[PDB]
């Protein structure tokens, strides 16, 4: 028995070893209680406003759309403390951990951004933070390791064999299974076993709620479409959630196409994978023909996840949301375009969403359309990656 539905259609569930069910049940009950608690909501709002900097701006980009009938707004999650939307939900999960009387946080990270988010939330709220990281991801992102340690977190390199995000996840869950009475597992996207897809959506949904209020104030109407990048699904479901029942508003999620879908080097399991059971959930994934999980690929480390949150798979299946992909080169061109024309350096993750909006505008430039792109993060972290590529190609 659960208090909430663990499934979105056929997708989702709680596919974890039996020993972890009490931890998930405890978390669900604490979350349901917290959502009914005005004092919890007031504390969460206080942190979001006075520490993280909400509400975030909704920026009109007139230079980008010149000569077309597209009007484009950017929801500026890049302006949030920490530089990405990830900060919203870690503050909520950290408060939820304290509601259950927990004083420790377990997390794991690949690109390092979720680890930085969990470390800053743990520092603020006085929680002991231990972070598992695949040692290869350790080496690939030593800045963020230093940031996490600066912020007092214990970073634990996982050697396993593949020393990657999935290997860090497994060690974090093994830790959690024996420590959940005192430690909370801070999952970093809207995926995994119930209740995490639900909790992460609800702790990200202020993105779409603010966007709705801001666009009604500025344009007097709802968007024709809201557009967000999809790695695991949290920034996209945070944008989408408040619009799901506004059926005139298109919901467009953008998976990384990597070197191109036909190359097999991509991270687009929702549209080009196959349903499996992994990460605690029944969801689309990248996997071999006999059921071994495949590696994904994207120029953007934040989108390099071989599965996707189950609510996205459900919204796709019923046709409420559409999912597309954008290649490395399309994302790179969108990154350059935003830098040059608006003075905003976007995350390469978010650049995938922008690239698809640029294609909607450029392919049909006399189509009138009001578009919102979720600018999920800032791209200072990516300037070295972008530099090495442009340098290697003669630019």
């Amino acid at each position: 028995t659960t208090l909430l539905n663990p499934y979105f259609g056929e997708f989702g569930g709680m596919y974890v070893p039996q020993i972890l069910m009490p931890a998930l049940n405890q978390l669900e009950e604490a979350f349901v209680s917290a959502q009914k608690d005005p004092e919890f909501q007031a504390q969460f709002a206080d942190l979001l406003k006075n520490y993280a900097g909400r509400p975030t701006a909704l920026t009109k980009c007139q230079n980008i759309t010149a000569g077309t009938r597209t009007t484009l707004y950017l929801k500026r999650e890049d302006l949030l403390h920490g530089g990405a939307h990830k900060t919203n939900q870690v503050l909520g999960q950290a408060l939820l951990a304290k509601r259950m009387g927990k004083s420790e946080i377990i997390a794991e990270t690949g690109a390092g951004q979720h680890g930085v988010a969990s470390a800053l939330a743990s520092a603020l709220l006085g929680l002991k933070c231990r972070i598992y990281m695949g040692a290869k991801d350790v080496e690939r992102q030593s800045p963020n390791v230093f940031r996490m340690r600066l912020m007092g977190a214990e970073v634990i390199p996982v050697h396993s064999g593949s020393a990657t995000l999935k290997d860090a996840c497994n060690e974090a869950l093994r830790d959690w299974s024996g420590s959940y009475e005192t430690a909370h597992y801070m999952l970093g996207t809207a995926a995994g076993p119930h209740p995490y897809p639900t909790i992460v959506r609800e702790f990200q949904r202020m993105i779409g709620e603010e966007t709705k209020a801001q666009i009604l104030d500025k344009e007097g109407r709802l968007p024709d479409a809201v557009i967000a990048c999809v790695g695991g699904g949290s920034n996209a479901i945070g944008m989408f959630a408040d619009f799901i029942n506004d059926t005139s508003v298109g919901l467009i999620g953008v998976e990384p196409g990597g070197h191109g879908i036909e190359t097999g080097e991509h991270g687009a399991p929702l549209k080009h994978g196959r349903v499996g059971i992994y990460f605690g959930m029944k969801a689309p994934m990248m996997q071999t023909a006999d059921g071994q999980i495949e590696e994904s690929y994207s120029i953007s480390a934040g989108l390099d996840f071989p599965s996707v949150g189950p609510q996205h798979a459900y919204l796709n299946s019923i046709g409420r949301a559409d999912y597309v992909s954008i290649t490395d080169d399309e994302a790179l061109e969108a990154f350059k375009t935003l830098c040059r024309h608006e003075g905003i350096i976007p995350a390469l993750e978010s650049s995938h969403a922008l690239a698809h909006a640029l294609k909607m505008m450029r392919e049909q430039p006399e189509k009138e359309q009001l578009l919102v792109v979720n600018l999920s993060g800032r791209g200072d972290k990516d300037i070295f990656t972008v530099h090495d590529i442009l340098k290697a190609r003669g630019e």
């Binding site: 709680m14 974890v16 069910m21 396993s160 996997q287």
Partner: protein, 255 residues
């Protein structure tokens, strides 16, 4: 399952516990793994628990993840695992054979088709390590349609409602992983659970005798066996003699 019922009936007649080793199929390689398994049986294993190498494991961890890696390094596919299973059964008609699976390998080609293949090769039970009883219905149903016993873990943080579900839904044996074993066994006997095998930290003869004395039907030993395999990767022949000596010791403790 029938093999489990027959096994436990015979052991109860003998006033005996079961000793059940675990190994990963194809670790360190196919022929050696077949050799390992025949050595475990000749040394006195009453049943087998056999792991199918998985891309991304969890309810196991270290000693076993290496075993999985070794089996992958040898290139062992699930289809090769089913071929080894058929051969093991062809050599050993009565020994109960249990698989330790992860859900995606059961789901991958259709759940009913997976359990159909288990029945074809003569497997007796399947434990899906990441399917809790709450999610188990389609797995249990397919298992029973193909005469496969669904195995469930009774964990240390179990509660009474979990005990009643595990007792009601499991067949073959109950995987026991806090209440003193005695009281947990009492409640499992009261609820008519499948005979319990203690499977946590079983690595010495006194733990085997302790589990049977507590009222369990036997003990499952996993990491200890795979450690002996780990230790003697460069000495295939020493590996088998050490495995024989450990299993013979563990089985003796159950009498």
């Amino acid at each position: 399952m029938e093999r489990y019922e027959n096994l436990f009936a015979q052991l109860n007649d003998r006033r005996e516990g079961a000793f059940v080793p675990f190994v990963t199929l194809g670790d360190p390689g196919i022929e050696q793994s077949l050799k390992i398994i025949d050595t475990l049986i000749d040394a006195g294993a009453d049943a087998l628990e056999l792991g199918v190498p998985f891309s991304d494991p969890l309810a196991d961890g270290p000693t076993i993840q290496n075993a999985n890696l070794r089996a992958f390094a040898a290139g062992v596919t699930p289809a090769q695992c089913f071929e080894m299973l058929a051969l093991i059964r062809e050599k050993h008609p009565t020994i109960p054979i249990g698989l330790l699976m992860y859900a995606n390998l059961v789901f991958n080609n259709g759940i009913d088709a997976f359990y159909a293949r288990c029945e074809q090769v003569g497997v007796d039970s399947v434990l899906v390590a990441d399917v809790p009883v709450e999610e188990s219905a389609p797995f249990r149903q397919a298992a029973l349609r193909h005469n496969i016993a669904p195995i469930f873990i009774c964990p240390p943080n179990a509660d009474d409602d979990l005990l009643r579900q595990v007792a009601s839904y499991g067949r073959g044996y109950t995987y026991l992983l806090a209440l003193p074993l005695h009281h947990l066994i009492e409640k499992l006997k009261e609820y008519h659970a499948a005979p319990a095998l203690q499977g946590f930290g079983i690595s010495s003869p006194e733990q085997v005798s302790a589990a049977v004395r507590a009222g369990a039907a036997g003990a499952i030993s996993g990491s200890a066996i795979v450690k002996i395999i780990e230790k003697n990767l460069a000495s295939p022949k020493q590996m088998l003699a050490e495995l024989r000596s450990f299993v013979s010791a563990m089985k003796a403790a159950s009498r």
